[PDB]
Write a protein that binds this ligand. Sequence first.
Ligand SMILES: C[C@@H]1O[C@@H](O)[C@@H](O)[C@H](O)[C@@H]1O[C@@H]1O[C@H](CO)[C@H](O)[C@H](O)[C@H]1O
Ligand SMILES: C[C@@H]1O[C@@H](O)[C@@H](O)[C@H](O)[C@@H]1O[C@@H]1O[C@H](CO)[C@H](O)[C@H](O)[C@H]1O
Ligand SMILES: [Mg+2]
Ligand SMILES: [Mg+2]
Ligand SMILES: [Mg+2]
Lengths: 141, 140
Amino acid sequence: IGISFRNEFFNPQTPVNIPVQGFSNGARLRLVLLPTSADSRFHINLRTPDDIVLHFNARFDEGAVVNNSTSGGGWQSEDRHANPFQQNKIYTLEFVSNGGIISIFVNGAHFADFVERTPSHGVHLIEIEGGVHVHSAHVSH
Amino acid sequence: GISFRNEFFNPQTPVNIPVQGFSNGARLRLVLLPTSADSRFHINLRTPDDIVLHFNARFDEGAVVNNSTSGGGWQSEDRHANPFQQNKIYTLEFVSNGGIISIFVNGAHFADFVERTPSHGVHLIEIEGGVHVHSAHVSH
Ligand SMILES: C[C@@H]1O[C@@H](O)[C@@H](O)[C@H](O)[C@@H]1O[C@@H]1O[C@H](CO)[C@H](O)[C@H](O)[C@H]1O
Ligand SMILES: C[C@@H]1O[C@@H](O)[C@@H](O)[C@H](O)[C@@H]1O[C@@H]1O[C@H](CO)[C@H](O)[C@H](O)[C@H]1O
Ligand SMILES: [Mg+2]
Ligand SMILES: [Mg+2]
Ligand SMILES: [Mg+2]
């Protein structure tokens, strides 16, 4: 398992599954991504050992982003947003976690807030799956 | 394969740390406690072909010796006083400055080491010998 002096990795293979030491107190995850036509959805999960704190799901089949989470392994209430992505275009997607709110930006502009339902301090894994190519992934605490 | 856990605690010696991104400004910070288990310990910063810096604390000789390899053979030593005592805690930091690695102990400059081969491609840190590692941290 390799680490980086800049906490950044290029061209990781999907599905990407990357350990992280919590995701709170101002942690930022920056992804440069290209949604693909290989699947009609892709998602990013910020997972603790027990639950998903945030599941961010881009859905080209439904024309939406769906955010949700699990508690005791069951899905909670969905937040639905417009889909800010187009397949085969490049996006910089950032998540920023502080004070129980995970703020989400696309190409530098605020896209949505997610009010977490389980503490993001317990996050231990960043998972990226589905119809998406990850060009780069970076975490700053 | 890859991890954003750039700081970790209490790894067992010997520690093998696969790394990338050792460029100008990169900093390795270790909190260590030398032990009586062996009269020496060392830190190697390696590329896939050579040791860029072998930092070796020696309680038997009363010195730190720095060196490097070319084609697997040792080059010329730099020898310094030993700043460490067994069973005391030290923060040891190595900073790449794009050709000179600057080494600090407890926040004070200890020594510079002039690289004998470029270190851009350092891919592996090893920590071995009579030392307990409380933490390792890579950053800029
Ligand atoms: C299970 C429901 O089925 C579909 O028709 C969706 O429109 C709903 O959102 C549900 O899908 C599930 O939604 C969760 C998040 O709430 C996950 O995205 C899961 O992958 C998806 O199957
Ligand atoms: C082989 C030499 O043995 C003693 O004379 C030491 O005082 C010298 O420093 C040499 O020791 C070797 O030094 C290299 C670095 O030049 C490595 O530390 C190696 O482990 C050590 O045996
Ligand atoms: Mg399919
Ligand atoms: Mg500089
Ligand atoms: Mg400089």
